[PDB]
Amino acid sequence: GYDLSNSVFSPDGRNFQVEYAVKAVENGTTSIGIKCNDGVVFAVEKLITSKLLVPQKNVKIQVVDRHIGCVYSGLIPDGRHLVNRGREEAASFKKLYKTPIPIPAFADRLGQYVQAHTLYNSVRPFGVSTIFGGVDKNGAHLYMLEPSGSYWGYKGAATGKGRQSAKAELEKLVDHHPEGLSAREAVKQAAKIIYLAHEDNKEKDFELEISWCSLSETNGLHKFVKGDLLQEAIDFAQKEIN
Template sequence: MTSIGTGYDLSNSVFSPDGRNFQVEYATKAVENGGTAIGIRCKDGVVLAVEKLIGSKLLVPGSNKRIAMVDRHVGLACSGLIPDARHFTSRARSEAASWRKFYHTPIPVSSLADRMGGYAQAYTLYSSVRPFGVTAIIAGMDEEGGPGLWMVEPSGVGWGYFGAATGRGRQAAKAELEKLPLPNITVKEAVKHAARIIYFAHDDNSKDKDFELEMTWVRHEKLATAESGEGIVKGWGKHEEVPKELVAEAEKLAKESMVEGGDDEEMEVEE
């Protein structure tokens, strides 16, 4: 992309002659330089995983979380500019709290994604602000809709996904996600896949930066009865960190897979 000499990249409120908003494209570029983040929608919940790059040896391991809790049943992972991600997360929490106040019930994942998409899009309209330099992956479980996974981009557009990826390793991660039989896997299976995909995407970028694998899930302990459909979950879910022992096991398998040259097994995606 180039805008040198055009004069159309100085403001959000001006389109180029071919209909482009350069400020949005610049924000998207900022996301592409961030650590990889993925979301996997399963039959019994949703898994979020991020590649948290370590910029200094002085940082405390496990600190500076990249995945945040928005509400008890919703988690949010961002890739891009960390300050923008914190503000975006704060706004998401305000939207969830506002919904509870007026409707006396937790906010559905799709409604939260719609609201956050509208908020992000508002920052592409005025010359006094700039677009958010983040792409957010929103994961949760509704009482009615079950597991939900949405991704909101800097332009404000939001899509529902079975598997979503953003950040610098998004292309490699997306290719691996397309091989999974989504959404017909469990969250425990998705944890192993997520670790392998993050390690694969990190290695594919051929950069020597150290990173930490951060992973959470949203799930409900009680599966549906046979009358309501096998594998479908009813009730509000709970967002929490994946147990450390499961993450450690998944990382061990991911590292072994990288040494062996990756997983050659390919599976068709079922939607």
């Protein structure tokens, strides 16, 4: 019984519910966040379930404000509620203080919302991990938010099934470039480790979506990488894994 809910406590410091929420996020697809010098670059592995689908017509990276990219894994519907909530909170701050929200401020807000869902009998703690960042005027920042309401700064973060492949390769990238790398050069890097993170997920086929927010390419807005730039990334990675 004391292993069933969130308002319970147990004399092991465990609160079994919340730990079970990580297990939800562990069924998700790989999502990485590459922190570069100029901004942030997200990419998500998007499973192609069937050849019946209409392709490139589902976005798992949703914008909050005009400058904070948000991409999440775990329960897809559950995550859509958390993003809607952070779009309310962004909009409240934009009115009350007439500037686009800082990212350490966006962090406070979301952080509070999921923490809330471990203190009542009548709620369930959300089982999603978010990865969100952008450019504000104090510079680019990146945050990963655990379903437990835990978060930290990050020069590279990931979550998903293929968080195993992805993490080791991010170590490789801070030891390649310990003085950082360009946001343009990092499009090709997000392609490379999303492809490698589909060797823990090779029972299907997938589509790669890449988006960026960097100061120096997009004027500090959260945009998608699209057209011919996007296929250069696909080819690059495709040839390394062959």
